[PDB]
Design a protein around this ligand. Structure first.
Ligand SMILES: CN1CCC[C@@H](Nc2cnn(C)c(=O)c2Cl)C1
Length: 111
């Protein structure tokens, strides 16, 4: 639609910080450690995590909201692809994605 403004970036920071404070965000705060899953980086071609997104927000990496949403969606898509549906990581991804949608709707409403 329209490119992100400085005021949009304040809203992105608020959304990201809300995700980072969520109780079920613990699997996604930092990159997957190869010890957590030895074949992870051979299976997942574009890893993503919230610390990486935080660095990108601080550097003003994102020009459009769709790019920020795409990175967030990678976090959850990676998790559901690698893990079976009974895994605690998978369950966390389901909870946090629905929370992100709720926060995303609020962000778009405030624009
Ligand atoms: C660093 N941090 C430590 C706790 C959990 C881990 N997150 C994982 C680990 N393994 N797998 C398979 C995953 O999908 C995720 Cl999100 C990342």
């Amino acid at each position: 639609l329209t490119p992100l403004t400085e005021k949009d970036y304040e809203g992105l920071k608020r959304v990201l910080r809300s995700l980072q404070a969520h109780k079920m965000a613990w699997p996604f705060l930092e990159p997957v450690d190869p010890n957590d899953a030895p074949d992870y980086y051979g299976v997942i071609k574009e890893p993503m995590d919230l610390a990486t997104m935080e660095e990108r927000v601080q550097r003003r990496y994102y020009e459009k909201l769709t790019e920020f949403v795409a990175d967030m969606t990678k976090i959850f898509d990676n998790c559901r692809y690698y893990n079976p549906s009974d895994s605690p990581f998978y369950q966390c991804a389901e909870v946090l994605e629905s929370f992100f949608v709720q926060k995303l709707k609020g962000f778009k409403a405030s624009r």
